[PDB]
Design a binder for this molecule. Structure first.
Ligand SMILES: CC1=CC[C@@]2(C)CC[C@@](O)(C(C)C)[C@@H]2[C@@H](OC(=O)c2ccc(O)cc2)C1
Ligand SMILES: CC1=CC[C@@]2(C)CC[C@@](O)(C(C)C)[C@@H]2[C@@H](OC(=O)c2ccc(O)cc2)C1
Lengths: 239, 9, 235, 10
């Protein structure tokens, strides 16, 4: 396992180099949009982000050390959390707004979306309030990938797999601490910020579950276009 | 699954 | 304006939380093993309702909680109640591998869970959390810290004081780990491990909430008005 | 209005 052998700095470098790009939406200010067509812009964008996410996951240390069945499971459980934290990260420098894309920056003003919209804004405010660093962000994102589905996986052999994930998770924790120490934080401050960062994941999991329900409702209404990949990721959550 | 195939490359 | 919570020492914090602990309640005393949704859910909702009353009085004894306005106290409890019920359940079940100890006289395995549509999934998640807590050798002092963290955190974004108190509890958790002899590295590793579990607990709560919602709409198992309002708060 | 609000006062 090349993952467990990495140093903290090597871990951060690998995660930074693996970052997916920021994609554009098909938004057009000269074109009128309904609530459904606006939502169509987002589902289209999310679908495209997913393709990049899947290949990003391959570059997260330890992920490919897992069986294909386990990788599938982890991505199926964490995909929406990862899309969301990515969205919040983009919006950090834009108080009151969500940067779905460089050409699509919305405030809460512009259909049952407001509730989740507000939660995302609150998280963005939180990141800004904490002065969340890019190095910390990539750590958080990889933690979600490995953590969200680890307790919903048979044999003692299947138990060995989960053990590997825990060791990688511990390694990322070490990296987070390393980053904070370098930042000049006292030991007490390092432990506090670590807690603050990880508590974020609870709220992100919450937004993901609320979003999954909104997504299921969208499917049933059959008015907003949903990609096949998206429909399969949705079905994986058996709502 | 699609996710399954994409992971396989 | 200044809250007493922040002036408390680690040991003072620990004792306050331990002392605030609600009791372990019993279920009805019928020796039959519940398999049907009606009987089992009847026992569970009755138990949950009684645990809620104790939870509410417990929360008021969590340092820093009563320093919030009534409205903020209402919000936090409305958002955290199921997570708190579940972590309590998981805690009681730790020494009983493969079983969930809803009450000393109500110990159930997944075989009884799979007899109720959409129950075993949540059941297995609860078992996994219990097993995980057992393998980590979670201590009661740590357990109470995690529960208060849930109370203050879950609804904290859907809004400085709360975040300072949360920092205070983090200090307390580390304190307990150092007191137990853990090295510096083991301390933050263990801190991270425990907090990550809170993500899974949130997941179980959301799923449990949806399950409770369908129960309500099926209108078979009667729910108390208190339990109905705690559910209704989640839209 | 809410029972919870009352119980928090008791
Ligand atoms: C506030 C929102 C509410 C509606 C939901 C929860 C429905 C599903 C959603 O998560 C997204 C997949 C379109 C969406 C939210 O969209 C995103 O989170 C989103 C959209 C596009 C992306 O590339 C990333 C995230 C927007
Ligand atoms: C595996 C379960 C499935 C169904 C759910 C999620 C439905 C609602 C539930 O949370 C309980 C309030 C009836 C229940 C779960 O009950 C509890 O977690 C529970 C029940 C009674 C308690 O005193 C504490 C927790 C049991």
């Amino acid at each position: 396992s090349l993952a467990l052998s990495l140093t903290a700095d090597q871990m951060v470098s690998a995660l930074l180099d693996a970052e997916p790009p920021i994609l554009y939406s098909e938004y057009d200010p000269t074109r009128p949009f309904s609530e459904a067509s606006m939502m169509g812009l987002l589902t289209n964008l999310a679908d495209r982000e997913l393709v990049h996410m899947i290949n990003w996951a391959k570059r997260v240390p330890g992920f490919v050390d897992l069986t294909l069945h386990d990788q599938v499971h982890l991505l199926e459980c964490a995909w929406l959390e990862i899309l969301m934290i990515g969205l919040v990260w983009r919006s950090m420098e834009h108080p009151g707004k969500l940067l779905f894309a460089p050409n699509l920056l919305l405030d809460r003003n512009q259909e049952g979306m407001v509730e989740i919209f507000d939660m995302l804004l609150a998280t963005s405010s939180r990141f800004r309030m904490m002065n969340l660093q890019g190095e910390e962000f990539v750590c958080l994102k990889s933690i979600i990938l490995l953590n969200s589905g680890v307790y919903t996986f048979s044999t003692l052999k299947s138990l060995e797999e989960k053990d590997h994930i825990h060791r990688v998770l511990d390694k990322i924790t070490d990296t987070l601490i390393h980053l904070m120490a370098k930042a000049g934080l006292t030991l007490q401050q390092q432990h506090q910020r670590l807690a603050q960062l990880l508590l974020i994941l609870s709220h992100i999991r919450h937004m993901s579950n609320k979003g999954m329900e909104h997504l299921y409702s969208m499917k049933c209404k059959n008015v907003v276009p949903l990609s096949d990949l998206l429909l399969e990721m949705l079905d994986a959550h058996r709502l | 699954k699609i996710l399954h195939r994409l992971l396989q490359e």
